[PDB]
Each structure stands twice: as structure tokens, then as C-alpha cells.
Design a protein around this motif. Structure first.
Motif, mmCIF file in Angstrom:
data_model
loop_
_atom_site.group_PDB
_atom_site.id
_atom_site.type_symbol
_atom_site.label_atom_id
_atom_site.label_comp_id
_atom_site.label_asym_id
_atom_site.label_seq_id
_atom_site.Cartn_x
_atom_site.Cartn_y
_atom_site.Cartn_z
ATOM 1 N N UNK D 3 38.710 33.494 48.037
ATOM 2 C CA UNK D 3 39.063 32.548 46.939
ATOM 3 C C UNK D 3 38.941 33.213 45.571
ATOM 4 N N UNK D 4 37.798 33.816 45.278
ATOM 5 C CA UNK D 4 37.480 34.297 43.913
ATOM 6 C C UNK D 4 38.480 35.396 43.588
ATOM 7 N N UNK D 5 38.678 36.332 44.515
ATOM 8 C CA UNK D 5 39.536 37.513 44.268
ATOM 9 C C UNK D 5 40.977 37.051 43.979
ATOM 10 N N UNK D 6 41.536 36.153 44.783
ATOM 11 C CA UNK D 6 42.897 35.596 44.560
ATOM 12 C C UNK D 6 42.977 34.948 43.173
ATOM 13 N N UNK D 8 41.233 35.447 40.464
ATOM 14 C CA UNK D 8 41.071 36.391 39.339
ATOM 15 C C UNK D 8 42.355 37.203 39.218
ATOM 16 N N UNK D 9 42.992 37.530 40.343
ATOM 17 C CA UNK D 9 44.192 38.396 40.325
ATOM 18 C C UNK D 9 45.398 37.604 39.810
ATOM 19 N N UNK D 10 45.507 36.314 40.168
ATOM 20 C CA UNK D 10 46.668 35.446 39.812
ATOM 21 C C UNK D 10 46.657 35.205 38.310
ATOM 22 N N UNK D 11 45.470 35.107 37.731
ATOM 23 C CA UNK D 11 45.314 34.532 36.380
ATOM 24 C C UNK D 11 45.762 35.565 35.358
ATOM 25 N N UNK D 12 46.631 35.153 34.439
ATOM 26 C CA UNK D 12 47.244 36.006 33.392
ATOM 27 C C UNK D 12 46.388 35.963 32.117
#
Ligand SMILES: CCCCCCCCCCCCCCCC(=O)O
Ligand SMILES: CCCCCCCCCCCCCCCC(=O)O
Ligand SMILES: [Cl-]
Ligand SMILES: [Cl-]
Lengths: 13, 212, 212, 13
Positions: D3-6, D8-12
Motif C-alpha cells: 500500500x505505502x509504496x504504491x 508514494x510512487x503514484x503521488x505527483x
């Protein structure tokens, strides 16, 4: 004692 | 000096459940590995205690590099020194499919794809052998110098034989982390085989699994 | 293209029992690592699933490479991102002396001895990040190409900045097997800490220890 | 689910 390895390394045969 | 011609000469000089077959081949090839290492320039000149440390530290990566290169023309399998081929289906059916597939995908296929030659394999093996990080070496600097002379000779050989491929040298060196990882997993399997008693383990392979 | 200037920029952009302190620092630095990876050319262009695979595969080696380089002027110890120094005596007294000493002898001391610079550290980290062997990648070739562009840029940078040192590039790459090995042992420790419940493990570090 | 990794990566941001 690593008997086999010592024996094989020492031997000049 | 560290001439690639002698490193190649060392390679050429030394040419049923699957885990049992692989362990029996490992034990056989440990004897061969000692004869190989003696043929690598300056190895036999090291203190005996250091020769032991380096071969105890390196043997598993050195055997894996060898059977991986031997296997470049095998379809989804390996060729053991005993002449037995092992296919990934057999490895999977023995409970060791995951590590077997890493060998195929990270080593055999990558060696096949770049057509790694026996001088290159010999030099990568001599780099593995001359591991200045091996614990307890009487003089790590001496081993560091031998490693440096090997990779100097390798890079020169790559630039001369494959001058069309600027990145070949880097590509060869960048298989060594995969080999390290695969060696560690293979050693974990061997310790478990020894603990559980699921596999005959012959004397030299057993000795390599002894505490230092 | 893969310009070393941007790889350096990513590095600069992101600047009590010891195991608990180290785990708390790891959790903090995982957040930072995501921000670092986003700053590496072409990483954020990869499919999200591939970005996840690469960071799950690489994080431990990437953090170890970072705190190792951060520690080059520390005597027999490491500097954590939290600002806490950890000395080998404390690591030994916590039962983790062996892996701590490997970090000091194979990484910190070797980085100190060659005065590894932040561009070099950045490039080695980008090589680790772009791991084409990471399982489940949608297109490993794409990651292989990115790794090749990094090590091409690194070698060019080494030949230009340190033209007095023909073997510097090889020397940098030949720390990666040690890092692989050390990362695997550190991960084995973390799984044991999690199994035994001997250490608080914060959410992001816990997630990294989840099954895929 | 990572959850956390997805997130953080998605967020612009
Ligand atoms: C290859 C997958 C391994 C699965 C079982 C783990 C046993 C580890 C043994 C590794 C060394 C093998 C040496 C073979 C020697 C050879 O025939 O050339
Ligand atoms: C360094 C010796 C480790 C002994 C205990 C094992 C725990 C493994 C944790 C490895 C990751 C550490 C990340 C630190 C991040 C930092 O502060 O820069
Ligand atoms: Cl690679
Ligand atoms: Cl080295």
C-alpha cells in the motif's frame, strides 16, 4: 580441519 | 603479471533425483577446482592458509559459474560435469525450481546471449577466486593486487577481442552480484540438505560445509 | 539519455539499542528512497508495477550503499540518517557484530580508501535500482537498457574525472557483489527481528518485509 | 498489497 583441501593444495604430484 | 592465455589454459586443462546428482557432481568438481586454482597465475604462491580461505570462500560461485557456462547450449537446463543434463522441470519437481530458474535466467541465458567466451569465464572465476574480502587472509592487499591484475587483463582482452562492444567488460562484471546471490541461496539449500539428511553428501562437499 | 549531473542532483536532493535505532532509520529512509528514485532519469516513466518491483528488489542494497557512503569519515562506525552514529562496539554488544564489521571492511573502508564521490555513489545506486534480474518486470530489456546507460555514463565520468585511475570503474562495480551479500545478510537479520518480535519495526519497513 | 509504496510512487505532489 579442512583435511582434504589442505592435502590437495600441499601436494605437488 | 596475469596473462589471459594462462587463465584460458586453466579452463581448458580441467574439461536418480536431481539434487543427489547435482551434489555428487559438486563433490567431483571440488577436486577439479583445486587443480584449476593451482593453474591460475600466483595462486599457488599464496600462503597455504590463504589458498584454503580463498577456495572455501569462493568454491560455490566458482562451480556455479562453471556449470552455468557449460550449459549455454542446453535448453532450459544445465549440463553437470558427470555428463548428466538437468532440466528445469526436474528441478521444479524436486522442490528447487526457484533457484534453478535464477541460474537459467540470470547466468546461463545471459552467458548465452553475450556468447561469453572461456577466457572471459576464466577471468571472472579468477576475480572470484582472488576475493580480498575473504575473512582471515594473512595479507588482503596481496589478493586485492592479484584481483586488480586479473580485471586489468580481462578489460584489455575485451577491448582487443570485442572492440565493437564498449560495455562488454562492465556487462561481464555485472553478472558477479547475481552469482554472489545465487551462490548464497545454493549454499542455504546445501546446509538444509545436510541438516535434514535428505541427500547423500560426499566427503569434500561435506568438508566445505564444515565450520571454519 | 542518462546524465550523471541529474544522478548527482538526486543524491544531493535527499540529504536506545542499536538495532532499534537502525530499523527506525531504515523506515525513515524508505520514504526518502522513493523521492530519490523519482529523481533518477526515466525511473518514473516505468510502469508503476515495475517501479514497485525495482524498489522492493533494491531498497536494502540502496539504503546500505547510502549509509555506508555517509559513514566514510566515521571511526569504526556508521552515521544513520537520524543523525545517530553507531560504533562497532555497540553492534557487537547487540549480537550483530559480524554483519556490522562486513559493512565497515567491505563497504565503508573501501569507499573511504578510493574516496568514492557522490556521482559514483549515485551511479552505483542507479545501477542497483535498474536491476533487470528483478522478478516479474513487464519488460526486463527496458531496465537492462537503463542500467547500460547508467554504467556507460559512470565509466565516461570515471575516465574524465579520474583519468589517472584506469581501473576505478571496475573497482566501483566490484563493490556490488559485496553489497549484494551484505544486503542479503541484513535482510535475514530483519526477518529474524520480525519473527522473534525483538525490535519495533515501523510500517514501511514492515511492508518491505511482506510477501509479494 | 504494498500500500505505502504504491501510494508514494503514484503521488505527483
Ligand atoms: C542449480 C540449482 C541447485 C539446486 C540444489 C542446490 C545445490 C547446490 C549445489 C551447487 C553446486 C553445483 C556444482 C555442480 C558442478 C558441475 O557439475 O559442474
Ligand atoms: C548495519 C548492520 C545491520 C545490523 C542489523 C540488521 C538490520 C538491517 C537494516 C539495514 C538497513 C539500514 C538502513 C539505515 C538507513 C540510514 O540511516 O541511512
Ligand atoms: Cl547487468
Ligand atoms: Cl574488488
Amino acid at each position: 580441519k579442512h583435511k582434504i583441501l589442505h592435502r590437495l593444495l600441499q601436494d605437488s604430484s | 603479471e596475469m596473462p589471459v592465455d594462462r587463465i584460458l589454459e586453466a579452463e581448458l586443462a580441467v574439461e536418480n533425483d536431481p539434487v543427489t546428482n547435482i551434489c555428487q557432481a559438486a563433490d567431483k568438481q571440488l577436486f577439479t577446482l583445486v587443480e584449476w586454482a593451482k593453474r591460475i597465475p600466483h595462486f599457488s604462491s599464496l600462503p597455504l592458509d590463504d589458498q584454503v580461505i580463498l577456495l572455501r570462500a569462493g568454491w560455490n560461485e566458482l562451480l556455479i559459474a562453471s556449470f552455468s557456462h557449460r550449459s549455454i547450449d542446453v535448453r532450459d537446463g544445465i549440463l553437470l560435469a558427470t555428463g548428466l543434463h538437468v532440466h528445469r522441470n526436474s528441478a521444479h519437481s524436486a522442490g528447487v525450481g526457484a533457484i534453478f530458474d535464477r541460474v537459467l535466467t540470470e547466468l546461463v541465458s545471459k552467458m548465452r546471449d553475450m556468447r561469453m567466451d572461456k577466457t572471459e569465464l576464466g577471468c571472472l572465476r579468477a576475480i572470484i577466486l582472488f576475493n580480498p574480502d575473504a575473512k582471515g587472509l594473512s595479507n588482503p592487499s596481496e589478493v586485492e593486487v592479484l584481483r586488480e591484475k586479473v580485471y586489468a587483463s580481462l578489460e584489455t582482452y575485451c577491448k582487443q577481442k570485442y572492440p565493437e562492444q564498449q560495455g562488454r567488460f562492465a556487462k561481464l562484471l555485472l553478472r558477479l552480484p547475481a552469482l554472489r546471490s545465487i551462490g548464497l541461496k545454493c549454499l542455504e539449500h546445501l546446509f538444509f540438505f545436510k541438516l535434514i539428511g535428505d541427500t547423500p553428501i560426499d566427503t569434500f562437499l561435506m568438508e566445505m560445509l564444515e565450520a571454519p
